[PDB]
Amino acid sequence: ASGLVASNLNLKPGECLRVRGEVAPDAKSFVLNLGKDSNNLCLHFNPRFNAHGDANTIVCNSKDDGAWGTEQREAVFPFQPGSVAEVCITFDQANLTVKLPDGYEFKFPNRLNLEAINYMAADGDFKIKCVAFD
Amino acid sequence: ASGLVASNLNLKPGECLRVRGEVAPDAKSFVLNLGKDSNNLCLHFNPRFNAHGDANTIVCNSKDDGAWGTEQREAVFPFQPGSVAEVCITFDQANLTVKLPDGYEFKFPNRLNLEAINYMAADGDFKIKCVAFD
Numbered sequence: 001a002s003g004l005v006a007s008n009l010n011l012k013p014g015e016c017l018r019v020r021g022e023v024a025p026d027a028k029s030f031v032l033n034l035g036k037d038s039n040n041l042c043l044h045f046n047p048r049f050n051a052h053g054d055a056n057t058i059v060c061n062s063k064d065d066g067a068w069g070t071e072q073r074e075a076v077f078p079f080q081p082g083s084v085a086e087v088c089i090t091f092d093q094a095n096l097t098v099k100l101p102d103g104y105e106f107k108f109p110n111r112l113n114l115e116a117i118n119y120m121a122a123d124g125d126f127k128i129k130c131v132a133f134d
Numbered sequence: 135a136s137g138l139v140a141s142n143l144n145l146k147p148g149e150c151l152r153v154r155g156e157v158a159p160d161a162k163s164f165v166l167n168l169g170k171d172s173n174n175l176c177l178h179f180n181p182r183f184n185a186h187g188d189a190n191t192i193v194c195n196s197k198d199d200g201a202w203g204t205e206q207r208e209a210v211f212p213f214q215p216g217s218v219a220e221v222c223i224t225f226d227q228a229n230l231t232v233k234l235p236d237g238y239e240f241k242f243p244n245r246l247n248l249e250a251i252n253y254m255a256a257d258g259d260f261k262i263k264c265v266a267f268d
């Protein structure tokens with residue numbers, strides 16, 4: 001019952017990836033992963049409403065050759081269960097820049113040194129409705 | 135590179151898939167495949183500018199267990215190299231409905247009797263700019 005999975009995205013540095021999806025009404029959290037494949041994620045975007053001991057906190061992390069890196073938590077939380085949320089992601093060799101529904105944007109280190117993002121996957125709590133490449 | 139590949143779409147009857155992309159300036163043909171998986175397609179949407187003996191011909195077909203079905207060809211070709219083109223495909227139990235860039239619509243029988251579309255793949259000279267699922 002997982003979410004949408006996309007491969008061969010070929011997102012290049014500077015390109016803006018816009019993803020709009022519906023957060024499940026009973027979601028305790030949701031995930032949007034970006035990277036080379038399921039075991040190599042340059043970005044594990046994980047807004048947690050009430051999950052894993054956290055409340056209303058965005059947790060980001062990287063996964064390299066299967067290994068999870070050091071998590072980074074964001075300063076804001078412009079998300080709510082049972083609503084449509086859109087995030088905009090771009091990257092360069094040093095960092096990924098993530099823009100949230102509230103227009104707030106932060107950076108997450110590009111720990112995989114990715115020069116292209118070909119994989120994206122959402123979990124069962126984030127129903128992707130639209131994906132744009134600009 | 136090649137073409138975007140999305141799985142776990144879970145597109146149900148009555149739902150529409152909108153795909154917008156850029157037709158290569160020297161496009162020969164491009165494909166949008168929809169179905170259960172790569173070897174089971176309810177719709178192989180293949181606009182051929184100049185390929186396989188076809189000149190500006192939209193060729194559609196189904197693929198059952200790897201075997202191509204009986205091709206269907208349309209009477210219009212609203213695609214132009216070097217221009218953005220959008221197609222809207224609606225899935226229904228009896229037929230899939232395709233709405234072309236200029237509003238022309240045609241149907242293609244759901245030969246595989248799919249109850250949902252979970253696979254989408256793009257190939258050829260068409261750079262996807264955005265996809266909307268519902």
Ligand SMILES: CC(=O)N[C@@H]1[C@@H](O)[C@H](O[C@@H]2O[C@H](CO)[C@H](O)[C@H](O)[C@H]2O)[C@@H](CO)O[C@@H]1O
Binds near residue numbers: 051
């Ligand atoms: C600050 C901290 O240690 N928080 C942790 C969460 O990171 C942790 O969630 C895990 O996160 C990793 C990414 O690092 C994987 O996504 C893993 O699947 C998650 O469970 C949770 C639960 O283990 O515990 C704390 O909140």
Ligand SMILES: CC(=O)N[C@@H]1[C@@H](O)[C@H](O[C@@H]2O[C@H](CO)[C@H](O)[C@H](O)[C@H]2O)[C@@H](CO)O[C@@H]1O
Binds near residue numbers: 194195202
């Ligand atoms: C008029 C006719 O029957 N032509 C066919 C070609 O269209 C066909 O090419 C393949 O067509 C399928 C769709 O059925 C895919 O688009 C595939 O990529 C094409 O190569 C060829 C080969 O099967 O046979 C006839 O020429």
